[PDB]
């Protein structure tokens, strides 16, 4: 249930991503890691939805 959605996007920038996820009322989890920094992960089966909502942020 942990995948890199972003790379090195700090909390101020991640606020964009967490917002679009939270807006649709989906399991949105904020993950910290070394190669990742700050990113947003979602429920494992809902992986498609996470990436889907970020398509409008590309």
CSV table of N, CA, C and O in Angstrom, one decimal:
chain,number,residue,atom,x,y,z
A,1,UNK,N,0.8,-1.2,0.0
A,1,UNK,CA,0.0,0.0,0.0
A,1,UNK,C,0.9,1.3,0.0
A,1,UNK,O,0.4,2.4,0.2
A,2,UNK,N,2.1,1.1,-0.3
A,2,UNK,CA,3.1,2.2,-0.3
A,2,UNK,C,3.8,2.4,-1.6
A,2,UNK,O,4.6,1.5,-2.0
A,3,UNK,N,3.4,3.4,-2.4
A,3,UNK,CA,4.1,3.7,-3.7
A,3,UNK,C,4.4,5.1,-3.8
A,3,UNK,O,3.7,6.0,-3.3
A,4,UNK,N,5.5,5.4,-4.5
A,4,UNK,CA,5.9,6.7,-4.8
A,4,UNK,C,5.0,7.4,-5.8
A,4,UNK,O,4.9,7.0,-7.0
A,5,UNK,N,4.2,8.3,-5.3
A,5,UNK,CA,3.3,9.1,-6.2
A,5,UNK,C,4.0,10.4,-6.7
A,5,UNK,O,3.7,10.9,-7.8
A,6,UNK,N,4.9,10.8,-5.9
A,6,UNK,CA,5.6,12.1,-6.1
A,6,UNK,C,7.1,11.9,-5.8
A,6,UNK,O,7.5,10.9,-5.2
A,7,UNK,N,7.9,12.9,-6.1
A,7,UNK,CA,9.3,12.9,-5.7
A,7,UNK,C,9.8,14.3,-5.2
A,7,UNK,O,9.8,15.2,-6.0
A,8,UNK,N,10.1,14.3,-3.9
A,8,UNK,CA,10.6,15.6,-3.4
A,8,UNK,C,9.7,16.7,-3.4
A,8,UNK,O,10.1,17.9,-3.4
A,9,UNK,N,8.4,16.4,-3.3
A,9,UNK,CA,7.4,17.5,-3.1
A,9,UNK,C,7.1,17.7,-1.7
A,9,UNK,O,6.5,16.8,-1.0
A,10,UNK,N,7.5,18.9,-1.2
A,10,UNK,CA,7.3,19.2,0.3
A,10,UNK,C,5.9,19.4,0.6
A,10,UNK,O,5.0,19.4,-0.3
A,11,UNK,N,5.6,19.7,1.9
A,11,UNK,CA,4.2,19.7,2.4
A,11,UNK,C,3.4,20.8,1.7
A,11,UNK,O,2.2,20.6,1.4
A,12,UNK,N,4.0,21.9,1.3
A,12,UNK,CA,3.3,23.0,0.7
A,12,UNK,C,2.8,22.6,-0.7
A,12,UNK,O,1.8,23.0,-1.1
A,13,UNK,N,3.7,21.8,-1.4
A,13,UNK,CA,3.3,21.3,-2.7
A,13,UNK,C,2.4,20.1,-2.7
A,13,UNK,O,1.5,19.9,-3.5
A,14,UNK,N,2.7,19.3,-1.7
A,14,UNK,CA,1.9,18.1,-1.5
A,14,UNK,C,0.5,18.4,-1.1
A,14,UNK,O,-0.4,17.6,-1.2
A,15,UNK,N,0.2,19.6,-0.6
A,15,UNK,CA,-1.1,20.1,-0.2
A,15,UNK,C,-2.0,20.1,-1.4
A,15,UNK,O,-3.2,19.8,-1.3
A,16,UNK,N,-1.4,20.3,-2.6
A,16,UNK,CA,-2.2,20.2,-3.9
A,16,UNK,C,-2.7,18.8,-4.1
A,16,UNK,O,-3.9,18.6,-4.4
A,17,UNK,N,-1.8,17.8,-3.9
A,17,UNK,CA,-2.1,16.4,-4.2
A,17,UNK,C,-3.0,15.8,-3.1
A,17,UNK,O,-4.0,15.2,-3.4
A,18,UNK,N,-2.7,16.1,-1.8
A,18,UNK,CA,-3.6,15.6,-0.8
A,18,UNK,C,-5.0,16.1,-0.9
A,18,UNK,O,-6.0,15.5,-0.5
A,19,UNK,N,-5.1,17.4,-1.4
A,19,UNK,CA,-6.4,18.0,-1.5
A,19,UNK,C,-7.3,17.3,-2.5
A,19,UNK,O,-8.4,17.0,-2.3
A,20,UNK,N,-6.7,17.1,-3.7
A,20,UNK,CA,-7.5,16.4,-4.8
A,20,UNK,C,-7.9,15.0,-4.4
A,20,UNK,O,-9.0,14.5,-4.8
A,21,UNK,N,-7.1,14.3,-3.6
A,21,UNK,CA,-7.4,13.0,-3.1
A,21,UNK,C,-8.5,13.1,-2.1
A,21,UNK,O,-9.6,12.4,-2.2
A,22,UNK,N,-8.3,13.9,-1.1
A,22,UNK,CA,-9.2,14.1,0.1
A,22,UNK,C,-10.6,14.6,-0.4
A,22,UNK,O,-11.6,14.2,0.1
A,23,UNK,N,-10.6,15.5,-1.5
A,23,UNK,CA,-11.8,16.0,-2.0
A,23,UNK,C,-12.8,14.9,-2.5
A,23,UNK,O,-14.0,15.1,-2.3
A,24,UNK,N,-12.2,13.8,-2.9
A,24,UNK,CA,-13.1,12.7,-3.4
A,24,UNK,C,-13.3,11.7,-2.4
A,24,UNK,O,-13.9,10.6,-2.6
A,25,UNK,N,-12.9,12.0,-1.1
A,25,UNK,CA,-13.2,11.2,0.0
A,25,UNK,C,-12.6,9.8,-0.2
A,25,UNK,O,-13.3,8.8,-0.1
A,26,UNK,N,-11.3,9.7,-0.5
A,26,UNK,CA,-10.6,8.5,-0.7
A,26,UNK,C,-9.5,8.3,0.3
A,26,UNK,O,-8.9,9.4,0.8
A,27,UNK,N,-9.1,7.1,0.7
A,27,UNK,CA,-8.0,6.8,1.6
A,27,UNK,C,-6.7,7.5,1.1
A,27,UNK,O,-6.0,6.9,0.3
A,28,UNK,N,-6.4,8.6,1.6
A,28,UNK,CA,-5.2,9.4,1.2
A,28,UNK,C,-4.2,9.4,2.4
A,28,UNK,O,-4.5,10.1,3.4
A,29,UNK,N,-3.1,8.8,2.2
A,29,UNK,CA,-2.1,8.7,3.3
A,29,UNK,C,-0.8,9.4,2.9
A,29,UNK,O,-0.3,9.2,1.8
A,30,UNK,N,-0.3,10.2,3.8
A,30,UNK,CA,0.9,11.0,3.6
A,30,UNK,C,2.2,10.2,4.0
A,30,UNK,O,2.3,9.8,5.2
A,31,UNK,N,3.0,9.9,3.0
A,31,UNK,CA,4.2,9.0,3.3
A,31,UNK,C,5.5,9.8,3.2
A,31,UNK,O,5.7,10.6,2.3
A,32,UNK,N,6.4,9.6,4.1
A,32,UNK,CA,7.7,10.1,4.1
A,32,UNK,C,8.8,9.0,3.9
A,32,UNK,O,8.6,7.9,4.4
A,33,UNK,N,9.8,9.3,3.0
A,33,UNK,CA,10.8,8.3,2.8
A,33,UNK,C,12.1,9.1,2.3
A,33,UNK,O,12.0,10.2,1.9
A,34,UNK,N,13.2,8.4,2.2
A,34,UNK,CA,14.4,9.0,1.8
A,34,UNK,C,14.5,9.4,0.3
A,34,UNK,O,14.8,10.5,0.0
A,35,UNK,N,14.2,8.4,-0.6
A,35,UNK,CA,14.3,8.7,-2.0
A,35,UNK,C,13.0,9.4,-2.5
A,35,UNK,O,12.9,9.9,-3.6
A,36,UNK,N,12.0,9.5,-1.6
A,36,UNK,CA,10.7,10.0,-2.0
A,36,UNK,C,10.4,11.4,-1.4
A,36,UNK,O,9.9,12.2,-2.1
A,37,UNK,N,10.9,11.6,-0.2
A,37,UNK,CA,10.6,12.9,0.5
A,37,UNK,C,9.2,12.9,1.0
A,37,UNK,O,8.9,12.2,2.0
A,38,UNK,N,8.3,13.7,0.5
A,38,UNK,CA,6.9,13.6,0.8
A,38,UNK,C,6.0,13.3,-0.4
A,38,UNK,O,6.2,13.8,-1.5
A,39,UNK,N,5.1,12.3,-0.2
A,39,UNK,CA,4.2,11.9,-1.2
A,39,UNK,C,2.9,11.4,-0.6
A,39,UNK,O,2.8,11.3,0.6
A,40,UNK,N,2.0,11.2,-1.5
A,40,UNK,CA,0.7,10.7,-1.1
A,40,UNK,C,0.4,9.3,-1.6
A,40,UNK,O,0.5,9.0,-2.8
A,41,UNK,N,0.1,8.4,-0.7
A,41,UNK,CA,-0.3,7.0,-1.1
A,41,UNK,C,-1.7,6.8,-0.8
A,41,UNK,O,-2.3,7.5,0.0
A,42,UNK,N,-2.3,5.8,-1.4
A,42,UNK,CA,-3.7,5.4,-1.2
A,42,UNK,C,-3.9,4.0,-0.9
A,42,UNK,O,-2.9,3.2,-0.9
A,43,UNK,N,-5.1,3.6,-0.6
A,43,UNK,CA,-5.5,2.2,-0.5
A,43,UNK,C,-5.0,1.4,-1.7
A,43,UNK,O,-5.1,1.8,-2.8
A,44,UNK,N,-4.4,0.2,-1.4
A,44,UNK,CA,-3.7,-0.6,-2.4
A,44,UNK,C,-4.6,-0.8,-3.7
A,44,UNK,O,-4.1,-0.6,-4.8
A,45,UNK,N,-5.8,-1.3,-3.5
A,45,UNK,CA,-6.7,-1.5,-4.7
A,45,UNK,C,-7.1,-0.2,-5.3
A,45,UNK,O,-7.5,-0.2,-6.5
A,46,UNK,N,-7.0,0.9,-4.6
A,46,UNK,CA,-7.4,2.2,-5.1
A,46,UNK,C,-6.3,2.9,-5.8
A,46,UNK,O,-6.4,4.1,-6.1
A,47,UNK,N,-5.2,2.2,-6.0
A,47,UNK,CA,-4.0,2.7,-6.6
A,47,UNK,C,-4.3,3.5,-7.9
A,47,UNK,O,-3.8,4.5,-8.2
A,48,UNK,N,-5.3,2.9,-8.7
A,48,UNK,CA,-5.7,3.5,-10.0
A,48,UNK,C,-6.3,4.9,-9.8
A,48,UNK,O,-6.1,5.8,-10.6
A,49,UNK,N,-7.0,5.1,-8.7
A,49,UNK,CA,-7.7,6.3,-8.5
A,49,UNK,C,-6.7,7.4,-8.2
A,49,UNK,O,-6.9,8.6,-8.6
A,50,UNK,N,-5.7,7.1,-7.4
A,50,UNK,CA,-4.7,8.1,-7.0
A,50,UNK,C,-4.1,8.7,-8.3
A,50,UNK,O,-4.1,9.9,-8.4
A,51,UNK,N,-3.5,7.8,-9.1
A,51,UNK,CA,-2.9,8.3,-10.3
A,51,UNK,C,-3.9,8.9,-11.3
A,51,UNK,O,-3.5,9.9,-12.0
A,52,UNK,N,-5.1,8.5,-11.2
A,52,UNK,CA,-6.2,9.0,-12.1
A,52,UNK,C,-6.5,10.5,-11.7
A,52,UNK,O,-6.6,11.3,-12.6
A,53,UNK,N,-6.5,10.8,-10.4
A,53,UNK,CA,-6.8,12.2,-10.0
A,53,UNK,C,-5.6,13.1,-10.3
A,53,UNK,O,-5.8,14.3,-10.4
A,54,UNK,N,-4.4,12.5,-10.4
A,54,UNK,CA,-3.2,13.3,-10.6
A,54,UNK,C,-3.0,13.7,-12.1
A,54,UNK,O,-2.2,14.5,-12.4
A,55,UNK,N,-3.8,13.0,-12.9
A,55,UNK,CA,-3.8,13.2,-14.3
A,55,UNK,C,-4.2,14.6,-14.7
A,55,UNK,O,-3.8,15.2,-15.7
A,56,UNK,N,-5.0,15.3,-13.8
A,56,UNK,CA,-5.5,16.6,-14.0
A,56,UNK,C,-4.5,17.6,-13.5
A,56,UNK,O,-4.7,18.8,-13.6
A,57,UNK,N,-3.4,17.1,-12.8
A,57,UNK,CA,-2.4,18.0,-12.2
A,57,UNK,C,-1.1,17.9,-13.0
A,57,UNK,O,-0.1,18.5,-12.7
A,58,UNK,N,-1.2,17.2,-14.1
A,58,UNK,CA,0.0,17.0,-15.0
A,58,UNK,C,0.2,18.3,-15.9
A,58,UNK,O,1.0,19.1,-15.5
